[PDB]
Design a protein around this ligand. Structure first.
Ligand SMILES: NC(=O)c1ccc[n+]([C@@H]2O[C@H](COP(=O)([O-])OP(=O)(O)OC[C@H]3O[C@@H](n4cnc5c(N)ncnc54)[C@H](OP(=O)(O)O)[C@@H]3O)[C@@H](O)[C@H]2O)c1
Ligand SMILES: NC(=O)c1ccc[n+]([C@@H]2O[C@H](COP(=O)([O-])OP(=O)(O)OC[C@H]3O[C@@H](n4cnc5c(N)ncnc54)[C@H](OP(=O)(O)O)[C@@H]3O)[C@@H](O)[C@H]2O)c1
Ligand SMILES: NC(=O)c1ccc[n+]([C@@H]2O[C@H](COP(=O)([O-])OP(=O)(O)OC[C@H]3O[C@@H](n4cnc5c(N)ncnc54)[C@H](OP(=O)(O)O)[C@@H]3O)[C@@H](O)[C@H]2O)c1
Ligand SMILES: NC(=O)c1ccc[n+]([C@@H]2O[C@H](COP(=O)([O-])OP(=O)(O)OC[C@H]3O[C@@H](n4cnc5c(N)ncnc54)[C@H](OP(=O)(O)O)[C@@H]3O)[C@@H](O)[C@H]2O)c1
Ligand SMILES: Nc1nc(=O)c2c(CCc3ccc(C(=O)N[C@@H](CCC(=O)O)C(=O)O)cc3)c[nH]c2[nH]1
Ligand SMILES: Nc1nc(=O)c2c(CCc3ccc(C(=O)N[C@@H](CCC(=O)O)C(=O)O)cc3)c[nH]c2[nH]1
Ligand SMILES: Nc1nc(=O)c2c(CCc3ccc(C(=O)N[C@@H](CCC(=O)O)C(=O)O)cc3)c[nH]c2[nH]1
Ligand SMILES: Nc1nc(=O)c2c(CCc3ccc(C(=O)N[C@@H](CCC(=O)O)C(=O)O)cc3)c[nH]c2[nH]1
Lengths: 251, 252, 250, 249
């Protein structure tokens, strides 16, 4: 029987690349999305055309709130409803925008979105994943190789990604007796934001020692596929940088 | 004019010792508390007996909520009202309890309390501190955890909150450096053990500590805070000083 | 045509498993050894039985000395003379024993810092100087417990910390040549051969994931990943393969 | 009775400021030097004019060699000979120059860079510990050890090894009451041979004040770590870098 995976924020960009690579490896996939319905459905169509009834979409807001635990439970439930099992959880979805400390969304909403998507929803999904469980069960968190060299005015995003390191490690420890491995993949610069001008993209690209270019989405996905594979069966609590050396570069 | 400091969770234990040492160094102090009003006021009475009108109290819940930004602005405002300045912020207050991943409070309440006290309230307090200096030896000290990367079993939300606080310490150091505000951390290993912890369990922890087989006094933690806010640390920002007796170096 | 790899300390244990897995992946191998000639030769004969002319051995002491640069250049040269190319270097060989603060101390320095750090550096130098479709990389065998050191192992621990520095420094400097430099950090894998089972069990019981040590093959699996086409943007990274051991407090 | 300290590489720059501030704090000092004899003697003269018989010089090469253990033992011995005790060791001396991977012999470069930055600190730590209050060791680390400068591999290896020594020795020497810590500058006094434009480039990188640390600011962290206000601190490395290490590329 084929294994099944949940990928959050999987309609586009790195999450799509991860869903596609898992599918190509033989997984059935739940493509979670928030606003990108058309893209999520187009991806699911493509994957089901390759192999019937191996892709479903699942919509949810992962902003923090008192119903977020129920929403996260429902995402995991959606994998069991479609496929009867849930082997892999990939926490990819992420809000990302600056929140300057010195002076439109309220700061409460910014906290809820940035901390919710990058940390609290991963935690709740991890709880629900574990509660529902030869086998090769694992979680992969999308971290940030630059977490200790943060971008200016991104405090809440950075706090969220630091919390996600903590979750990765805490959950690795606590879920190891259940055979559930918990790891991270930490991009440096991969696909730059769609809104970024080409000159700003090239400023980042020129900083990367290995090739002066950003990681492709597929390169990020390659590290996720390794960590979910049998070739990583003793690996838990590890965060693999996929950054071309960027984090090693001084100012 | 004497400088002024805010210390969160200052009625007892490490926060109390930090407030006392700041006051002995010459600071005026805001003693923040949540439930410990009697002890906050007794501390203020002791400090004001030493120097009149140099200590005030301030009550607030630091759980995340719709009112937390306002609550944190009013803590910083209380320092300006009492003393006309706010030179130092010490983010000490902290909720601490296990949150197992597998199975009275709901998980969302636990998120609010553990992430609010350890991370979001420090962030909001940091914002309000800086904004009130938006136009001297100004600094922030965050109480971290030397064991952040060897966490206790079933403490995921606490640990996430302390990891977030490392990120805030570093992010705020970078962003606030142009304003001359330094942002640093002090990371205890084991200091004063929880009052509800059994004597046997306290001794198990003490026996793990390489340096002296004992926990840090609250005063030893406070000594590192005093260093970081002093003129002897004026080039130090974004640094987290472990005060742990070697505990974090000990393998399983 | 087949890529070629150098594996130091490849006659036994984790090095041997790495050499086997690289050979199974299609590499020609140089099996470096110091004292274990019979084991090195038996491995070579096994590999060449699988595919003729795909394995050679190379003897060298990797203790620090005045001759170590020449010894390291000769190891790399042996790969070129055998196979015409050198695509992968795996720095595995390692002296390991306690050196309490309270053999002469200069010999202990030479052996522990030489094998764990200075020979990796010199091999890296020589590897790169010969490279002054391709997928060139270096993998250093690190230690997941490098920041939670074992008592009285200061020189070993210094050597492994230096190896982290080498990994990162060489990743930065060699990136323009397309040479990636990464690490694999075991926690506990194969325990020392003479260690009593009761002592091995003290370690095993500490490992969150399965209460067991890693096989040599599981360590080799991470090396195979890092040298593969699936790791082409990964440089300067150290992958723990430790079952969560480094996360466990005292 | 006044405690005594050994400071390696103490004739000039950061080591000099450390020796001065320890002396001002009440320590007797051994001013170790390699080539800077005139400066070392000058410092000892200055400190002894303030308090007689409180400073001596001690010459040694700290390059790795088969005699380095003997040399390190003799530095510690020189503190006992002068002052009858040795309370503090500051491992400051350091060779620093690039060693490109793609192209002094390489063996000499290994010896100098790994010797001064790592092996000599280890042997001095051994000798300090064996010869034994508030005893401690402070190692001069590098806040940029994980964001290394191009072509500085051997230097960087030495500093990484020094982190390991700091931690290992903290663990092993704790039962003896000897604390072992580090101070990690980012940019402090820039090299004398660095050109002005390059110095200004480094300064402009520093978030906190766009200036390098003074030698005295680095010494201030050393003073803290040797003091009674650090009595529970061991195995800690304090960055004194103005935020430099937090700045991305
Ligand atoms: N791109 C990089 O260079 C880079 C660098 C470092 C780390 N990373 C990490 O790698 C991961 C993927 O990066 P990326 O650039 O592909 O991400 P992205 O495009 O910025 O965001 C991925 C998805 O997150 C979803 N999302 C955002 N807010 C949400 C919310 N409130 N509820 C639910 N889902 C929400 C969005 O789904 P919808 O579109 O359906 O609304 C979005 O498509 C992220 O965790 C990121 O932090 C990326
Ligand atoms: N003790 C240790 O060994 C240790 C180890 C590692 C790190 N640390 C860190 O060092 C700091 C001090 O430790 P500690 O043991 O002294 O702390 P603690 O006694 O556990 O807590 C300090 C104070 O936090 C306040 N607090 C808790 N929840 C709050 C809420 N919802 N709103 C506002 N304030 C709240 C309480 O104030 P009221 O009493 O007024 O309600 C409490 O007295 C903490 O940040 C802790 O994480 C301590
Ligand atoms: N085993 C573990 O649990 C563990 C844990 C953490 C890290 N690691 C690392 O993983 C790697 C492999 O571990 P392992 O246990 O397989 O290693 P090992 O058996 O201790 O040693 C591997 C080989 O190193 C060679 N070696 C030792 N001293 C040498 C010298 N002076 N010159 C040249 N070669 C020398 C020996 O070759 P000959 O036999 O031919 O003389 C030996 O067989 C090492 O780097 C180790 O530090 C292992
Ligand atoms: N300056 C910075 O910005 C900076 C940045 C990061 C870290 N640090 C660290 O802080 C420390 C002090 O830095 P610094 O700039 O003051 O150092 P420095 O001037 O580069 O060197 C200090 C002294 O080291 C001695 N030394 C060099 N090679 C030696 C050898 N073979 N044997 C014995 N002693 C030798 C020299 O003594 P003689 O003059 O007597 O020959 C020299 O004066 C060093 O550990 C350095 O790595 C400094
Ligand atoms: N979820 C998620 N999505 C991403 O795209 C992403 C990245 C991409 C890299 C990146 C880093 C900094 C800025 C940056 O400096 N942004 C500034 C300036 C933008 C500009 O100049 O266009 C901003 O204000 O956004 C913009 C992009 C990192 N982490 C991420 N996480
Ligand atoms: N705010 C705050 N207050 C504190 O008192 C405190 C401490 C004290 C140290 C401490 C450590 C473990 C446990 C503990 O409960 N351990 C678990 C066992 C799990 C484990 O230790 O891995 C227990 O049930 O004993 C309880 C207390 C750390 N961080 C803190 N932050
Ligand atoms: N190269 C290399 N080879 C290895 O085998 C290895 C290991 C194996 C793990 C390990 C850790 C500590 C001790 C330990 O405590 N050893 C003590 C006691 C041994 C015993 O009790 O039998 C020692 O004195 O050797 C022995 C073994 C780590 N790093 C290594 N690097
Ligand atoms: N002992 C010791 N003495 C020092 O003076 C010192 C320093 C000072 C800072 C420093 C930084 C870079 C270069 C430098 O040379 N940079 C190269 C460019 C490479 C790069 O910066 O990545 C150059 O040629 O400038 C030279 C000096 C750091 N560590 C030190 N240790």
């Amino acid at each position: 029987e084929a294994p099944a995976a949940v990928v959050t924020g999987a309609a586009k960009r790195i999450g799509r690349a991860i869903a596609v690579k898992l599918h190509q490896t033989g997984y059935r996939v739940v493509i979670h999305y928030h606003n990108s319905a058309e893209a999520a459905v187009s991806l699911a169509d493509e994957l089901n055309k390759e192999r019937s009834n191996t892709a479903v979409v699942c919509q949810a807001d992962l902003t923090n709130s008192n119903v977020l635990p129920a929403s996260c439970e429902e995402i995991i439930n959606s994998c069991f409803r479609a496929f009867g099992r849930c082997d892999v959880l990939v926490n990819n979805a992420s809000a990302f925008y600056p929140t300057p400390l010195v002076q439109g969304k309220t700061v409460e909403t910014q906290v809820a979105e940035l901390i919710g998507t990058n940390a609290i929803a991963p935690f709740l999904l991890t709880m629900s994943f574990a509660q529902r469980q030869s086998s090769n069960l694992s979680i992969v968190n999308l971290c940030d190789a630059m977490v200790d060299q943060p971008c200016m005015a991104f405090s809440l995003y950075n706090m969220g990604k630091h919390a996600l390191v903590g979750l990765t490690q805490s959950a690795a420890l606590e879920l190891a007796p259940y055979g559930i491995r918990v790891n991270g993949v930490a991009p440096g610069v991969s696909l730059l934001p769609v809104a970024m001008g080409e000159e700003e993209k090239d400023k980042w690209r020129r900083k990367v020692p290995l090739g002066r270019r950003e990681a492709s989405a597929e390169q990020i996905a390659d590290a996720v596929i390794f960590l979910v594979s049998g070739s990583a069966q003793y690996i838990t609590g590890s965060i693999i940088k996929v950054d071309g050396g960027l984090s090693l570069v001084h100012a």
